[PDB]
Design a protein around this nucleic acid. Structure first.
Lengths: 621, 621, 622
RNA sequence: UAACUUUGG
């Protein structure tokens, strides 16, 4: 009877029951939502500074998704029994939330914003990640911060050749696609996916499927905001078009005219030149003449640079390097570069390069993951490393940051679906990708190098995988779609996207979108051009390799697998374990019988393994 | 190296020999003492900067208590076999030392000071912590730093109805009270305790007991200082009384009436008016020399503000939030808020709020603590989290800092004495308390939330526990004692204290005191008012619950126990685990046989446990 | 993208094949070399900032040596299964590379430079560390940074009375000396070693041996640089001799007296009377423009500082603290200061002081080290701690930094060779050395205190070990060799070196050298003076102790050991530990079963151990 | 009818 919520218990969303509550908990945050999606509960908070730090210069947004093991009725596994540094899940999901909302803050807003999402209860069916996205969105636009429309989110699956909305953990066991999507009422904003070799049509279909489905939730949020959101924080942007045109009136040609040596990316040299030029004589202090903030001109400059380029590409047709929109950079794959490593590749495309090395392991090498939804054992590990020398800079080394965890994850999603099944190949695989040069999708370079490194390693990959990173320039009067984008091209795009798959379908599509009006018709085309690119890349790729090696490396351990009758396990293990010990001692192979009668035999020889297997079969057949 | 110590191998203190030595070791620190309390030996160092960092702002004191595992003839258990990040003990004891000395530095002093205490040898009887406090004190007032009088410290126990001074680890096994106290010769400064349901009389009796007992040691220190301390470091403020007087006239009346008022949130016009007004009339500008630095004048304002607020309270009797000295804020406890969690509560008191979740576990969930004195297994874990959203702010999230470890520990002390025995309740208990709003003791809110959440979880707590945080205004002509203080109020109080306990006695008393003059007779009253308060709050509390649930939640493992013949264990485990795991997989119950024949079966259904038990017995006959 | 390497697949070097490749990998670094020494492969990069950060102050060089577990076909064993924090090897090898190159950058250069060395493949024979250093050197002087290399490196072994170049890990098993050495064509720059009690003669011999054998690699690099290096980055030094004479005329008196001071530390004198004094005289302003930069005089000031101080020693063999070049500071060792700790010592020499504590443990206490080349179990642990109060400062506490890891390692190398064999003494040893005061080699103080602390602990050390830190002034005419250098004396030396050994030979020699000109005749003498010093110090040391205790501390533990058939290990562990834990529960002894069937049983009583042993034997016999 | 127990990064 104290406190005053205010709930939108409403919505049955995908036939699952979603509650949005505010005004009971954390009433001191700017906005705070306790969201429930039938039995899974998360708390999301938004707080924002009511003023700017002296010379900010960039928008300082922070998102913390965090899981508490009590949400699953467990105590942490660590030696400390307390949750600590974020897990892979926590890192990824934070990014998942960050990505769509970041570019939805009103132009020029650069006050501290922080979103904490804490998962409080996990029902073992509805993943708290999507719920987490929704609750964050809700909290934000309840806070009164200048944050444009609410967003919604959804996960799309593909079972029985049909789209399924927010598939439960169990339903996902059945699905040929894990697609997460976030966007507003107007624009779809973020896509992250893992796909079982499905068609562009299928995938893009699921993108629109989500975009419709999630509207229910966006409406629900807008409803709760109208009963309960705060007074908007007064901050309207600044018509910069005024001063911006009066900058074009000077450094228009002065920039255009010459980036653009190029090399030694300086480029930077002429660039800073132009910057400083407009800076003084543009407008500032004492006084005499003017006027117009000295710091705020910096941002107006980068916007103009950005602009200038785009138009250059829109109107014939050629990009900063001398190349076409459709042109992929020269490519060279090269396998077995580190002959004693289980598998190795060098993949180079233009000025992006990755050394990738496969390593084969046994059961003792697979990774324990203390998931909220119950602990699992991960046998495919991919680690992505982005050292500063790759871009010709110096910088702090040591322990992956978010970006590296993300890119790793992307490449991981790309490759996983092509891995052979346990039965066929009972090894754990760890790929490490070392980005040694970078100028536009090192992550794609990662997937391609991995495809090769695995083949070198002798992994019966069902089909090899390629990746390309794309951009899209969109003006009111027309649009360009860019293939294999440069570093300098990353920010010009209204939308950046990365596609990887096989010669028969997509396996991962990721999309980041900055502005509304990227119409399903444009997206169709974007993908089709990428189809052509990854196809070409694959072409160039498998002239290095083209199919998996017959065998694992001479340094790789040998694991082979065999099935025996369940009622026979007692005779092979023997009276505790008299027989099997003798087999393991004598043949010198590890023999794991577990329990369905699936025996996996390992050793350094092929012979030791066959010696063992022969022994067992004489007892069984 | 020929040496000149200077030793005070002195005092039977509490019947143990205490040695204070200087001049032999660490001669380059400003002060360095090798303290020994009959066989336990620590080295304490004090060093301080001889000048201030440019715009300091706050007094930068650091205390590092650290244990070296060789002190107990052990090698660290880590993978690294080197001692590393501080333990719980290490963090707590540093705070314990920090707390009393921090406010004893001369007003205005803001140079770096660091105290290192290193435990060198542990005799498995006399705890290094107390000795550590002593040693620190000694080193400081030997250093020449502007540190006022020495402090002493003591632990008081309570065995067989009598006060025990510095009880040894064995003595403490019999004691119904762990009370640690620190102070100067004039005042008690710091109290931290864990208490088995003892009366305010007995507790406070123990505080005076310590206060007198420690004088022997303060004496000892004073003595060593005169044989061996350094030249005092020349420093002195800065009298603010003067410039305060020129401002007490200017805005006095202003802020004064500018208070009652009321509502506008913290009175506004005359408030900020007075602020910038007094700023203007003074503070350089300069325009006129003299004076200010509107950092130094800003500080003098805070002091002035406080002074009138306090005066406001002494003369009727009404507080910032317009409540009586004795009035506790509205309170609402709420159980089972996350119904799948083993036990949950939301406790809300005014603008302080904690979500508390109990989680029940077994033996693999209890925490290893390798104390110097012997490694033990902790089965009651309390983790306190203080996210910045609680107070409307943004901040770095991740890895609990000292204050959170402290507060957790406080709440832990408060609850532990009411825990059921292993026999009655064979579970590991982990409470985590998430502070979602904060305006005055979140730690006390944590105790109350915990007491409820445990009851929700079905833990046969012997009695429920409540906590209140109090304050004290002290002027020459009178005093006010405040109940359930606001945040704002912790600043102006001359003494802050936190009391928690049951309907029948105290379970934790913590005190922090900034000034002398805090009479035994005043403390008696202070506690008695708190007695009334925590009683009130308990009243409010248990209208939400009042007694433990008879049973543990449907999601908590139920644990049942049965015996089997030792000569049969092999039949139950079966060939390679084949049987046992079949039973665990099918019945869904975990089965723990170990070894004398004790089988303990657990699961969330009683149906699974009984199914398992039936299965087991058919094999056992 | 098409490549243009440029490889120097050349050199048979010590009968291994060394390849240096550039132009295929990491073409965006300033310099990038993939080096292979027959089947071991590393990638080294060098990058340098083309401009200086605002008011830099110091030359900001960073070296990252890192190993990737795939280089040996293995997956990291962490709970994360990813390489993380650097390992000891990783930390030390970074230092190893850092040390020789740092003082080879052209005077006054203070732009960011970073060297990353990543081990990509390890052939289980040729260590990547030497290769690492070579590759670094190569990458650097391909980058076109102002770096006065190239440098080479080598490791020298001593098997069957002859120097062995770049011994393989198997060859090292037989060697009585692990000596790694780096230098330019003109000077040896860096020496780090662990030595089995070998003569100064033989050790110095190995130093020259390396210096000659490494020329091959230097030349190889110079060759690849001429086919492939970049355009040198224009940065000309600055004739500082110009200003520097003027300042001698001002503060050259003001400095001499302040040193003649002591100990302030402080030194308020130097503070003021250098400082703004010389700056008032010379230095940009507001008031006076023309000329010198307030920053760059700082550097010139330090160099004048050194110059005065040095000169004082050549003119009057008398040093800051009033002592002779050969004079070691007063020394006092003290054992059993922490009588319950297994062994303890206080070592004080002048104003450097270490508390050192030995601790005995069993097999559960030895440290797992998963080297690329094969995971092993380390049973001798030495941890060195250098807390800021030792020098009168305040500072972050916690997790040892590179320097502490290094100094620990140094002391470790110094003592290890005199450890008893496992047979005689089957314990884990952990030494912890707490540096409680410091004014010149705390590391050496560490080895001395350790020698004592282990003796106190009862460890049958074959011979005790001492160490001394030395310096060298080398001028246009003559040279001084300084014994037991002060902190202040570390900076001025053209060469710093630390020597430790027994009364019968050297155990560890470390050298860091700033300039050429150091004839083998100078080193011979330098070492011989140090011989006298460490001899002297040992003398003063075993006034405190003299020989190991007959027995281990009363607070134990004791270990007795027994052999059992391998096919019986199963019956002593029992079904799921059923037997062994019951044995450890009841007898109260730790039970350590190896593989050969070598069981070591340990506890605080002999009675507990015998109970355990009897129990196991009852299971074992007939 | 228990395969040889100890799993801190």
């Amino acid at each position: 009877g104290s406190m005053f919520d205010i709930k939108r218990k409403t919505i049955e969303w995908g036939g699952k029951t979603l509650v949005l509550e505010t005004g009971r908990i954390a009433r001191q945050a700017d906005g705070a939502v306790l969201a429930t999606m039938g039995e899974t509960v998360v708390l999301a908070t938004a707080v924002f500074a009511k003023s700017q730090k002296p010379g900010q210069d960039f928008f300082p947004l922070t998102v913390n998704y965090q899981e508490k093991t009590f949400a699953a009725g467990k105590i942490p596994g660590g030696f400390f029994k307390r949750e600590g540094r974020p897990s892979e899940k926590e890192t990824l999901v934070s990014r998942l939330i960050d990505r769509p909302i970041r570019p939805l803050f009103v132009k020029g807003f650069k006050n501290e914003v922080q979103v904490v999402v804490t998962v409080l209860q996990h029902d073992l069916e509805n993943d708290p990640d999507i719920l987490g996205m929704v609750a964050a969105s809700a909290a934000l636009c309840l806070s009164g911060a200048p944050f444009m429309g609410p967003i919604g989110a959804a996960r799309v699956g593909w079972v029985d050749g049909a789209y399924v909305l927010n598939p439960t953990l169990d339903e996902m066991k059945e699905s040929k696609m894990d697609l997460v999507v976030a966007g507003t009422a107007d624009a779809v904003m973020m896509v992250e996916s893992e796909i079982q070799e499905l068609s562009e049509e299928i995938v893009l279909g699921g993108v629109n499927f989500a975009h419709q489905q999630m509207q229910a939730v966006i409406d629900a949020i807008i409803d709760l905001a109208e009963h309960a959101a705060k007074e908007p924080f007064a901050f309207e942007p600044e018509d910069t078009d005024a001063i911006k045109a009066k900058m074009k009136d000077l450094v228009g040609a002065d920039i255009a005219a010459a980036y653009k040596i190029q090399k030694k990316q300086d480029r930077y040299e002429a660039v800073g030149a132009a910057k400083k030029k407009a800076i003084a004589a543009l407008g500032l202090s004492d006084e005499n003449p003017t006027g117009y903030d000295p710091l705020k001109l910096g941002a107006i400059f980068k916007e103009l640079e950005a602009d200038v380029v785009r138009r250059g590409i829109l109107d014939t047709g050629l990009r900063i390097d001398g190349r076409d929109v459709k042109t992929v950079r020269p490519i060279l794959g090269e396998v077995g570069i580190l002959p004693r490593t289980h598998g190795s590749a060098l993949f180079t495309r233009g000025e992006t390069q990755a050394i990738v090395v496969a390593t084969l392991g046994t059961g003792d090498d697979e990774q324990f993951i203390d998931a909220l939804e119950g602990t699992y054992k991960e046998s495919f590990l991919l680690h992505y490393n982005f050292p500063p020398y790759s871009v010709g800079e110096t910088g702090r080394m040591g322990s992956p940051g978010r970006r590296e965890i993300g890119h790793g994850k992307l490449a991981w999603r790309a490759l996983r679906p092509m891995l052979p099944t346990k039965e066929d190949f009972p090894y754990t695989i760890r790929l490490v990708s070392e980005i040694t040069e970078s100028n536009g999708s090192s992550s794609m370079a990662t997937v391609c190098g991995s495809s090769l490194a695995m083949m070198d390693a002798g992994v019966p990959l069902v089909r090899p995988v390629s990746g390309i990173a794309m951009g899209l320039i969109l003006e009111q009067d027309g649009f360009a779609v860019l293939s294999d984008i440069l570093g300098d091209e990353d920010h010009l795009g209204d939308m950046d996207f990365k596609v990887a798959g096989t010669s028969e379908g997509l396996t991962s599509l990721q999309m980041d979108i900055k502005i509304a009006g990227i119409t399903p018709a444009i997206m169709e085309q974007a993908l089709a051009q990428a189809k052509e690119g990854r196809a070409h890349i694959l072409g160039e790729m498998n002239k290095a390799m083209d199919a998996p090696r017959a065998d694992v490396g001479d340094f790789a351990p040998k694991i082979e697998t065999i099935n025996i009758p369940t009622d026979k396990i007692r005779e092979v293990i023997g009276s505790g374990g008299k027989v099997i010990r003798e087999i393991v001692a004598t043949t010198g192979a590890k023999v794991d019988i577990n329990d369905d009668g699936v025996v996996k035999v390992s050793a350094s020889d092929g012979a030791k393994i066959k010696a063992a297997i022969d022994w067992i079969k004489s007892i069984t057949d």
